[PDB]
Design a protein around this ligand. Structure first.
Ligand SMILES: CC[N+](CC)(CC)Cc1ccccc1
Ligand SMILES: [Mg+2]
Ligand SMILES: [Mg+2]
Ligand SMILES: [Mg+2]
Length: 340
């Protein structure tokens, strides 16, 4: 049961949850990876990692992925949560130089991950290990696209560092643009492709129905995170959240902002249902009788199916994960799973 202020009946009724069969092995393998890569202290891994549910989030999303593809994705995803925590702590503690150096190393490791597998910063070496594995599944054209997208993500994190150090809350529209980058919309969208075993040609993945379905899946996920992570973000002096932009720039009360975010999330669902029909019609059109057409049709169908799965995976993750349970913490501003 989800509390009424966060409950989305359409998700519960029309987006049934799915779980990849590799999940039990994935859970342990990513936990071990966090420990062995020294991304979290051993005691925090043992106490918190499984309860954070990072592998459950990916195993409810990339259905049909080969096990080793899912493992690379789950390691990258867990890494990205640890990176969000590092970024937050660098801001809180005023470590502008350490953040700037990490930012530069991530840009370089993204282009040459093999070179960084044994870097002295374990966060950099862990990133490089997951990215090198992701780069082994599809042609180098996909790797170049992943890199282009992630360079843009790193710079969005840098912009968040500057906003928080200056005490600036972005306006609503500025925030919505930024959030497509800090949530890594295009990375999750890129990762659909190794999960279904096919790099999609530009003409296919830029078809308006594919693009719009991909966008709406991510807008839902990011704004639902904003809705559910608002309490811990207020407690932590985080400024990046649609609800915070609405309160700051449109004078909404907390209750009014929650209602507005919820309505925007709900609309993403029914806009997605409409565009999903068009995206699946496009998948049917790709099945032109040829072998390549069958492959592309099947890949698009699998990808759109996972765009749909993201809704339910993200929904349930926010109720299951210890990451958001601010009411349980000794210090609401310092989650117990971060290294402070
Ligand atoms: C902070 C982690 N993340 C990607 C894992 C940003 C890089 C946003 C996110 C939060 C919650 C669910 C899904 C993604
Ligand atoms: Mg965060
Ligand atoms: Mg963040
Ligand atoms: Mg959040």
């Amino acid at each position: 049961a989800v509390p009424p202020s966060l409950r989305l009946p359409v998700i519960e009724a029309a987006f049934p949850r799915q779980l990849h069969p590799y999940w039990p092995k994935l859970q342990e393998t990513t936990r071990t990876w966090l420990l062995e890569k020294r991304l979290m202290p051993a005691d925090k891994v043992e106490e918190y990692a499984d309860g954070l549910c990072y592998t459950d989030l990916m195993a409810g999303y990339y259905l049909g992925a080969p096990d080793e593809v899912l493992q690379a994705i789950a390691d990258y995803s867990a890494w990205s949560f640890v990176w969000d925590d590092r970024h937050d702590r660098d801001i809180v503690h005023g470590r502008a130089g350490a953040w700037r150096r990490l930012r530069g190393l991530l840009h370089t490791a993204l282009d040459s991950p093999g070179d960084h597998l044994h870097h002295e910063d374990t966060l950099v070496a862990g990133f490089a290990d997951s990215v090198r594995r992701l780069y082994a599944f599809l042609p180098a054209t996909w790797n170049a696209r992943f890199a282009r997208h992630f360079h843009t993500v790193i710079e969005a994190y840098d912009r968040e560092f500057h906003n928080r150090t200056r005490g600036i809350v972005p306006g609503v529209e500025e925030y919505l643009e930024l959030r497509r980058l800090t949530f890594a919309h295009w990375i999750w969208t890129d990762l659909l492709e190794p999960s279904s075993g096919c790099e999609l040609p530009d003409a296919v993945r830029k078809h308006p129905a594919y693009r719009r379905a991909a966008l709406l899946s991510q807008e839902f996920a990011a704004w639902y995170n904003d809705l559910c992570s608002l309490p811990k973000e207020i407690a932590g002096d985080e400024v990046h959240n649609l609800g915070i932009s609405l309160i700051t720039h449109h004078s909404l009360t907390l209750e009014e902002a929650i209602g507005e975010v919820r309505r925007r999330v709900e609309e993403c669902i029914t806009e997605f249902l409409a565009v999903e029909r068009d995206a699946l019609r496009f998948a049917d059109e790709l099945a032109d009788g040829t072998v390549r057409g069958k492959e592309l049709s099947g890949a698009v169908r699998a990808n759109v199916g996972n765009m749909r799965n993201w809704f339910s995976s993200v929904y349930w993750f926010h109720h299951e994960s210890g990451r958001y349970m601010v009411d349980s913490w000794d210090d609401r501003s310092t989650p117990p799973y971060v290294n402070n």
